[PDB]
């Protein structure tokens, strides 16, 4: 039967970038060329593979990662990028083999009074390793004295609200992203494009 890409792209609600959702896709047939060509995608860049070539290749598994960021941060969802998102929320390896798809979602994820349900990890002591998901809410020590739960001036809650308003500039508007990872192990392949 077919692979369920709709459940990712057409999902009504998306996850925050620090708590990005991953859908493991296996044991199915996938339809790509008709799926991608829609141009209802503001950002569409692939690394290590051609989007027209996927209808020929088979992979052991395919991962569809999904989250929401703001416009000025779409440039960070890429291999070898640095910044608040790529270092503290979602990081791709330097040899990332897959595609990054993004479309403006201002009509879905921004509210007149502002939507603060989309958060991101602002402070973290060390960078995330590739494909790491940190959902920890432990108070961040940013001074000398430890925090031990107590929040304050050298003790910050590591997550921060986005605040999407429909009237904000495109840089401050919400964008939904889908990252398709194509994994090739020395195992029998289960996902082939057709």
């Amino acid at each position, epitope marked *: 039967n077919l692979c369920p890409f709709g459940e990712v792209f057409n999902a009504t609600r998306f996850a925050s970038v620090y708590a990005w959702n991953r859908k493991r896709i296996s044991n199915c047939v996938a339809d790509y060329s008709v799926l991608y060509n829609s141009a209802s995608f503001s950002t569409f860049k692939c690394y290590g593979v051609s989007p027209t070539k996927l209808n020929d290749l088979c992979f052991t598994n395919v991962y569809a990662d999904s989250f929401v960021i703001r416009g000025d941060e779409v440039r960070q969802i890429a291999p070898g990028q640095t910044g608040k998102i790529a270092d503290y929320n979602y990081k791709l390896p330097d040899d990332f083999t897959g595609c990054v798809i993004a479309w403006n979602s201002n009509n879905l994820d921004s509210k007149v009074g*502002g939507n603060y349900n989309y958060r991101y990890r602002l402070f973290r002591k060390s960078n995330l390793k590739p494909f790491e998901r940190d959902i920890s809410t432990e108070i961040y020590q940013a001074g000398s004295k430890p925090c031990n739960g107590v929040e304050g*001036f*050298n003790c*910050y809650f590591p997550l921060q609200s986005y605040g999407f308003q429909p009237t904000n500039g495109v840089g401050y508007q919400p964008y939904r992203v889908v990252v398709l990872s194509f994994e090739l192990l020395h195992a029998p392949a289960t996902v082939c494009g057709k």
Partner: antibody, heavy 117, light 108 residues
């Protein structure tokens, strides 16, 4: 995007009390891990932090001004305010309101307040 | 009380040049430092925090390094919209402190 709009008179007689109010329209003053502070800048001079305040947590002031400074927060009207007592010509400066934390992330446009009689 | 000292007080460079501003603290402040840009008359804008992390939306030509007491802000290829005054600030203790600022000037 967090939007900070500040208001108040740009002319305060000496020994009087400077008062400014920053209205927040980009993020709920209650529903954000954001401190709410004030930074001033004398003409041609550097930047000086005045104080900050939390939604309830506590306030934190610059010790060089702590005796003259009062920062209050209003949530029903989404405002946090500043009051500087016994102002002098030394207090003639551009006053900014900022969404502070580790850094001061968002900045109001800045109100020049001149102290003269 | 932490004291921030920037170097140089004024710097003059050309478009496309590599620019480095230095900021030093009287005490150890780990990586808890932020860089700011202020064009004449406008409000400051945040460039980096934690010495190395670029704020979202900031052009990638800006980069920061350092820890403890010595810090560095660097613009790889200076562009015409980058000529301004630059401040550093620590958020390590309570009484926050700013540098005196570094004005970037056009070399003629």
């Amino acid at each position: 995007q967090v939007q900070l709009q500040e208001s108040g008179p740009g002319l305060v007689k000496p020994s009087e009390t400077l008062s400014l109010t920053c209205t927040v329209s980009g993020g709920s003053i209650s529903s954000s891990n954001y401190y709410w502070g004030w930074i001033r800048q004398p003409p041609g001079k550097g930047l000086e932090w005045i104080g900050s305040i939390y939604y309830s947590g506590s306030s934190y002031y610059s010790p060089s001004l702590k005796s003259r400074v009062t920062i209050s927060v209003d949530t029903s009207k989404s405002q946090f305010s500043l009051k500087l007592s016994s102002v002098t010509a030394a207090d003639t400066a551009v006053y900014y309101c900022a969404s502070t934390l580790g850094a001061t992330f968002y900045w109001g446009q800045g109100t020049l307040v001149t102290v003269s009689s | 009380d932490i004291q921030l000292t920037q170097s140089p007080s004024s710097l003059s460079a050309s478009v496309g040049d590599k620019v480095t501003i230095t900021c030093r603290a009287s005490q150890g402040i780990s990586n808890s430092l932020a860089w700011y840009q202020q064009n004449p008359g406008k409000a400051p804008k945040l460039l980096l925090y934690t010495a190395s992390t670029l704020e979202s939306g900031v052009p990638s030509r800006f980069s920061g390094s350092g820890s403890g007491t010595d810090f560095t802000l660097t613009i790889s290829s200076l562009q015409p919209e980058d000529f301004a005054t630059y401040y550093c600030q620590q958020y390590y203790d309570t009484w926050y402190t700013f540098g005196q600022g570094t004005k970037v000037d056009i070399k003629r």
